[PDB]
Every structure is written in C-alpha cells, then in structure tokens.
Paper text:
We discover FucOB from the mucin-degrading bacteria Akkermansia muciniphila as an α-1,2-fucosidase able to hydrolyze Type I, Type II, Type III and Type V H antigens to obtain the afucosylated Bombay phenotype in vitro. FucOB displays α-1,2-L-fucosidase activity and showed no activity against α-1,3, α-1,4, and α-1,6 fucosylated oligosaccharides. A close inspection of the crystal structure revealed that FucOB crystallized as a monomer comprising three domains from the N- to the C-terminus: (i) a β-sandwich domain (residues 25–260), (ii) an (α/α)6 helical barrel catalytic domain (residues 357–712) and (iii) a second β-sandwich domain (residues 713–785). FucOB as well as other members of the GH95 family follow a single displacement inverting catalytic mechanism.
A conserved glutamic acid (E541 in FucOB) acts as a general acid catalyst. Mutation of E541 by alanine completely abolished the hydrolytic activity of the enzyme (see below). To further understand the FucOB substrate specificity at the molecular level, we performed co-crystallization experiments with (i) wild-type FucOB and (ii) the catalytically inactive variant FucOBE541A, both in the presence of V Type H blood group antigen as the substrate. Despite many efforts, we could not crystallize FucOB or FucOBE541A in the presence of the substrate or the corresponding product. The structural comparison of FucOB and the FucOBE541A revealed that the protein structure is mostly preserved and that there are no substantial conformational changes (r.m.s.d. of 0.477 Å for 761 residues). The crystal packing analysis of FucOB and FucOBE541A structures reveals a strong π–π stacking interaction between W453 with two prolines residues, P765 and P783, of the neighbor protomer. Consequently, this protomer restricts the entrance of the substrate into the active site, supporting the inability to obtain a complex crystal form. To determine whether FucOB can convert universal O into a rare Bombay type blood group, type O RBCs were incubated with 200, 50, 5, 0.5, 0.05, and 0.005 µg mL−1 of either FucOB or the catalytically inactive version of the enzyme FucOBE541A, and analyzed by agglutination assays against naturally containing anti-H Bombay serum (see the “Methods” section). In contrast, the catalytically inactive FucOBE541A showed a clear agglutination reaction after treatment with the anti-H lectin.
Residue numbers in the entry: 25 to 785
Write the structure that this text describes.
C-alpha cells in the first residue's frame, strides 16, 4: 500500500519531450500541445539548494531537466529595462536559464526498450527526498532512484534490475543554449559562455557495474550491465560579489575538485549521506491533520487531486501539500547560495514567464513565508545575503533617479528596488518604492525567530537603518487638514478634502504612492504607510536591543508617531487610501491588509476595532475570476487565520488545491509559479501557531476540517519550538522548547496563561 501522506506518485508514465518543440513526434507529446505544458505538470523536482532537476520517468525514456541556480543571462541593466532572453547581455535584465537535459534512452539489446510495461510507478518520496521508479518487464523488476545530495553537491542516479546484466541505456545531453557537448571515456561534458560573459560547465559521469561502456559521438552507451550509477555535476563562474564583477573561479576548475570523487563513491554511501542530511531539515516539523479514507488515500496523486476537486475532504493530502512546500524551499534555498526565484530553482524555459526572476512585489517574500515558522531558518539566510549583495546595485539605480532626490536637490540616501531583480544587482521595470521596506521585514523576522544578536548587529541592523534612511529623505510632510495632499498629481476635491479634515500638521505620508493593482497615484496609500511603520518600529526595536544610535532612534520614534495611520471607513471596512473610497470588492489584491499579514500591526488582541474592519474588507472579497491565483490563496489563508477564522482560512487551502494546483502538486498561476507552494506553508502555520501579537496563540480558532490532529516542531518568535495536539474543540499536550529557560504568555483554549519552556533536544 502507498503512503497516505508525504508521497507524490503516479501510475502513469511521465510524458517525455525535448524542450525544443520541433524535436518531438506528435505521439511523444501525450495529451499536451506545448513542451512547456509538459514540463510544468509532469516533472517531479529534486534539488539541494544549488543544483536540481525536473524528472520525467517513462519505461522507454527518461528526461532530467537540469538546473543550476546561478545560470543567468543579463547584467547590471543600467537602463532599468525588462529585456531578457538567452542572449541578453550585460546591458539587459536577463533571466534564469535551463542548464541542460539528460536524456536516458533505455534499450533491450541493440533495439529500443518497450514503452509499456507492467506495474509502473514513479514517485517523489518526501520522507527521504528521493525520486523512485519501479516496474516489471519480461519477469525482470527494474528500479530507478534519483536525488540531489547536499554533502556530495551533485545529482545521483542509480538504475538496478532484479536479474544480472539486464540494464542497457544510451545517455545523451541536450542543450537549449548551443552548448559544446562532447563525450569522451565515461563522462559527457557540456559547457559554454553566455552572451553576458558567464561561463558554465556540466559533467555527466557514468559508473556502471558490469557490461560494456562506449562513447560514440556525443552519447554514452551502456550494454548488459548489472546496475548503473550516474553523477551529474553543474557549475558556473558566478560569485555573489559586486566588487568582483560577479565573477569567481572558473566552473571547470571547480568541477575538477569533487565531480570525479563523487562518481568514485559507492552509491549506498552517497544515498546514506543524503538521507541523513535531508532528514535533518525535513523531520524538524511533523504534522497530522487527520485520517483520509483508505479508498481515497490509495489513489495516485493526479487522481487524488481530481477526487479532491469533487470532495475536498483529504487531510492527508493537505499534509502532503504543506510538507511539499517545505521540501521545495529546502531544495532551492541554502545559506551560501542564491534565493529561490519564481520557480524555486527549476526552469526549462529559455525565455521564462516574468523572467523566472526575483519579484519583490510579493513573490520573493512569499517564497520565504514558511522559512521561519516551519523550522527552515537557514533557508532564510539566502534571501538576506542576497538582498545585502544586491544592495550596491540598488543604490546605483536609486541615486540615479532624480525622482528620489531630496528637497535640497541631493540624491536620496539608502536605496529601494524596482519590481524585478536579477543576480547582478540589476533592477527591472517599474519602481517598487516600498519594496526595500518589505525586505526589511524579512531581515527583522529572521532575528525575531532566532534571537541571533550577531546576525542583528553585523548584517540586519545596518541594512534596516539604511532602508530607514531612504524613507527619512522620501517622506512628505502634510499641513493641517492635509494641506499639501496630492492625488494623481492634482489637489483634492471638496469631497476628498473632507476625509483629510482630521489630518494633523506634520503628518508624514509616502508621496505619490500606489495601492497594488489599482487606484490613483496618491499620497499616504495605506499599503505604504503600513510598510514604513513596520520598518521604523522594527528598526527602533533593533537599536534598543543593540544599545545603538539612541539619539537617532529617538528621532525615528518621533517620525513613526507622525506617520498617517489606519482608518475605518464609513462602511466599516478598513480603508485602503486616505480617501474613504468605496471598497474594491471585485479586486484580487488586499494590499491595505498588509498590516494583518505579513505585517504585524493589526491583530484581534491588540487592535480589535481595526481587526474587525480588516475582517469586513476580506469578507467582501470574492474567490472567483482573477482571484484564483497561485498567490491569492496563501495570502488569504494567513489573513483569515490571523483574524481568528480558521474555517475561512481552510477554505483558502481548499481553493489552492482545487483551482491552482497541477497534477504534480506544483502550484500554477497559470503558468507554474512556486509562490503558492511556498506561501501555503506560512498560511497553514498561522492557522496552528501565532507569535506576533505579544505572545503565543496556540490554534487561535478551530478548523472544522481538522477535528483531531497534532503538530511538532513549529517555530515561534523568541526562538521557541512548539509541539501540541488537539481533539474535539480543545488543545492538549502543549510543549514549548528553547535553548534557554523562558516564561511566555500563552493563549490556548480561550484562556491566557504563562508557560515555561523545556530544554531543546
């Protein structure tokens, strides 16, 4: 019997096509028409934070769409444009690129093997992070295994058979970038230099047991082998340092230091080291939402999803969805490497949607919503190190914009970002003015969840203060009654001026802001005011914790108190602008709800009137049309949970699975966008534990779809690990762990208590 959770599998062979459309037969496409549709829905991903593959397993052929997180076109992009493509130069924005493909054409003898076999299954086992394939043919049981090893820093494949000498396959390497491919001995090497100057090189090392190996052309033929281990190594010359012009040691020199050593190891030792390392991150969080009926839990993932759309009652599938997001984050974000982009690190497009880049409008943030609460804190370091490394480029583009100039005609202090960012300090497309403030929330929350004072002083606080310096220069002061208020560049009408009657002189507002996705360009947009208030408050807290800059922090506290705050509209909704406009109930964005999540300003415990207004705004929002996005469901899940609506929050988990989830459990915008997989981790975490409103809140509101369950290993602010179970309407077995003894205010079962922490194990 198959596992009811933590296992994504299918009894149907994956559709195997070349990414180049003209290279496939019509039969090879299956039900699809485009090779990008095949890639996003059929592949199973593996990764170790730097190298990964989307796996397409079939009895006759196998495709591994390879990736290295640093393979990027483009460059500094001084013009601030959004041009990309595989030939984008240093003057263009660029995009994440596919490293290549490994095609395995299995053979019986000298003829191709059968395409249909018996009892075929392909599986991605989240319990050990291994892609597994199994089938039978002519009385022989074949088995394949694949994973991305962190300790070995390579991809490891292994093909076995129940009878000796029954493995034969042809290994070839495909490239969409015109790479120079050559096969000599037992290694296929492909390499190239992008138009922007970055060098890359990959190597496929073939290590069979028995049989004969031959390198004919640019392929390698294995015949009548007992088994076969394959090692895939990929490097670029990228270095996350602007001072070195983003160039480090050559990829060939790096591969010469470990690639052959990994291929010389015994496969059982590589797999043992991978499983041990992988479980050290995956097993940190265990969760159980209930039991699914065995008739449903035995279905393969594509059929189980179709069953979910008709009957969305599958707690074990939702646990798989939750853990899959943790799996994907740990497989694409590690300290020392680049952060996860729009698609984690998996991409076969030469020209991807939105350049598969770093979108700071929400996607990159969402990618790391579950990093802290789901106990993957070191994955968050990739984002902070990246924001710090990209900062010199952001200062260049920010200071070059005269629209940011201060009142004295001088360039602005600090920096902010455009909507899109690459890995060379380049910024693309429109300006995202409060974007750097959003990064500062992530910068702070990493300290808030770990208590790492060294991190706060050495890296976090210097970045936060600089981002504060930008807003000290850019903030605009309004007179009494909002004298200088401007909307769309023009003064307020007589009716609009009535909403500004209570505006006190000296009020600070973000000038000429924009509430994401609609509305006029207008001062004091709630979205911007909430982000800046969160930035000033967290920076003042960091200064106090560090005992630093007492005079400046005292001044920033003054400015914080003068920032235009939230208002409740005449209809009871939380206002989105300083102008009490009619609620945009048909809109898919709730940008003025940032203060509820991921911001920490509005809460039912501390601000009950504002929280009721925010709940009204969300209640009047629909879940149809363009609201069915990969990023809408997880944001709305966390919002409903923080407003005390566990049932409404669970309905957004159902919506993500019903309308924006592919048969391989990857979330789709459309097309495939991993922000849904990432963000739903943070959303479900808020349904279980909240630690932002002055203490621990254990399951603040019940979830009728989860009548009985338990969780272990969730993280709370203050570096506290939380374990508990629940049955009926009550929570029991609450255990709090920390490195040092602590007493926390804990709200549980509708009662406010204080609890002591136990020693962490």
């Amino acid at each position: 019997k198959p596992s009811a959770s933590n296992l994504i599998w299918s009894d149907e062979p994956a559709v195997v096509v070349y990414p180049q459309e003209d290279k496939n037969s019509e039969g090879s496409f299956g039900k699809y028409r485009k090779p990008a549709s095949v890639w996003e829905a059929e592949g199973y991903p593996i990764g170790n934070g730097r190298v990964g593959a989307m796996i397409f397993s079939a009895p006759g052929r196998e495709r591994l769409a390879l990736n290295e997180i640093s393979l990027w076109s483009g460059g500094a992009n001084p013009g601030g444009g959004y041009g990309y493509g595989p030939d984008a130069g240093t003057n263009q924005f660029g995009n994440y690129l596919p490293f290549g493909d490994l095609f395995v054409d299995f053979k019986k003898g000298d003829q191709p093997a059968s395409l249909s076999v018996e009892d075929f299954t392909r599986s991605l086992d989240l319990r050990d992070g291994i892609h597994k394939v199994n089938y039978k043919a002519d009385g022989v049981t074949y088995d394949r295994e694949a994973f991305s090893s962190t300790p070995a820093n390579v991809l490891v494949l292994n093909y076995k058979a129940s009878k000796p000498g029954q493995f034969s396959a042809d290994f070839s390497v495909n490239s969409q970038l015109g790479a120079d491919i050559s096969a000599k001995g037992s290694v296929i090497t492909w390499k190239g230099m992008l138009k922007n100057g970055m060098n890359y090189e990959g190597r496929v090392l073939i290590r069979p047991k028995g049989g004969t190996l031959s390198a004919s052309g640019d392929k390698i033929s294995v015949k009548n082998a007992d088994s076969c281990m394959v090692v895939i190594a990929m490097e670029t010359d990228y270095l996350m340092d602007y001072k070195k012009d983003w160039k480090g040691e050559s990829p060939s020199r790096k591969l010469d230091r470990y690639a052959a050593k990994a291929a010389s190891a015994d496969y059982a030792a590589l797999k043992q080291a991978h499983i041990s390392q992988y479980k050290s991150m995956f097993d940190r969080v265990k969760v159980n939402f209930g039991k699914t009926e065995e008739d449903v839990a035995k279905l393969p993932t594509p059929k189980r999803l179709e069953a979910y759309k008709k009957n969305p009652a599958d707690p074990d599938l939702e646990e798989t969805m939750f853990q899959f997001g943790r799996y994907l984050l740990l497989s694409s974000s590690r300290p020392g490497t680049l952060p996860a982009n729009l698609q984690g690190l998996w991409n076969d497009y030469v020209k991807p949607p939105w350049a598969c880049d770093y979108h700071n409008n929400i996607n990159v943030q969402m990618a790391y919503w579950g990093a802290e609460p789901a106990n993957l804190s070191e994955c968050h370091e990739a984002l902070v190190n990246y924001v710090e490394a990209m900062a010199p480029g952001c200062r260049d583009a920010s200071q070059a914009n005269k629209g940011f100039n201060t009142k004295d005609g001088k360039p602005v202090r600090g920096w902010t970002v455009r909507t899109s960012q690459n890995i060379f300090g380049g910024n693309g497309w429109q300006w995202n003015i409060p974007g750097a403030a959003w990064y500062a929330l992530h910068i702070w929350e990493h300290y808030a969840f770990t208590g790492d004072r060294k991190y706060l002083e050495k890296q976090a606080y210097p970045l936060m203060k600089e981002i504060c310096h930008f807003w000290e220069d850019h903030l605009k002061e309004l007179g009494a009654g909002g004298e200088g208020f401007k909307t769309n560049g023009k003064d307020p009408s007589e009716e609009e001026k009535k909403d500004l009657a209570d505006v006190k002189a000296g009020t600070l507002v973000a000038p000429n802001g924009w509430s994401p996705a609609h509305g006029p360009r207008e001062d004091g947009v709630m979205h911007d005011q909430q982000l800046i208030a969160e930035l000033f408050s967290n920076t003042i807290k960091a200064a106090r914790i560090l005992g630093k800059d007492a005079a400046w922090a005292k001044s920033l506290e003054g400015k914080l108190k003068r920032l235009a705050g939230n208002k409740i509209g005449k209809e009871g909704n939380l206002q989105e602008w300083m102008i009490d406009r009619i609620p945009k109930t048909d809109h898919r964005h709730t940008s003025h709800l940032f203060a509820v999540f991921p911001g920490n300003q509005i809460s039912k415990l501390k601000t009950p009137k504002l929280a009721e207004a925010a709940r009204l705004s969300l209640e009047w929002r629909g879940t149809t049309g363009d609201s069915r996005r990969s990023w809408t469901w997880p944001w709305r899940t966390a919002l409903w949970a923080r407003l005390g609506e566990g049932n409404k929050a669970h309905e957004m988990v159902q919506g993500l699975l019903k309308f924006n989830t592919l048969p391989n459990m990857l979330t789709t915008h459309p097309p495939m966008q991993m922000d849904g997989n990432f963000g739903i981790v943070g959303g479900i975490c808020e349904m279980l534990v909240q630690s932002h409103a002055g203490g621990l809140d254990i399951m603040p509101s019940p979830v009728e779809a989860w009548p009985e369950g338990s969780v272990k290993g969730l993280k709370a602010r203050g570096n506290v690990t939380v374990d508990f179970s629940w049955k009926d309407g009550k929570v029991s077995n609450v255990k709090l762990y920390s490195a040092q003894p602590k007493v926390l205010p804990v709200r549980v079962n509708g009662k406010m208590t204080r609890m002591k922490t136990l020693p962490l194990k």
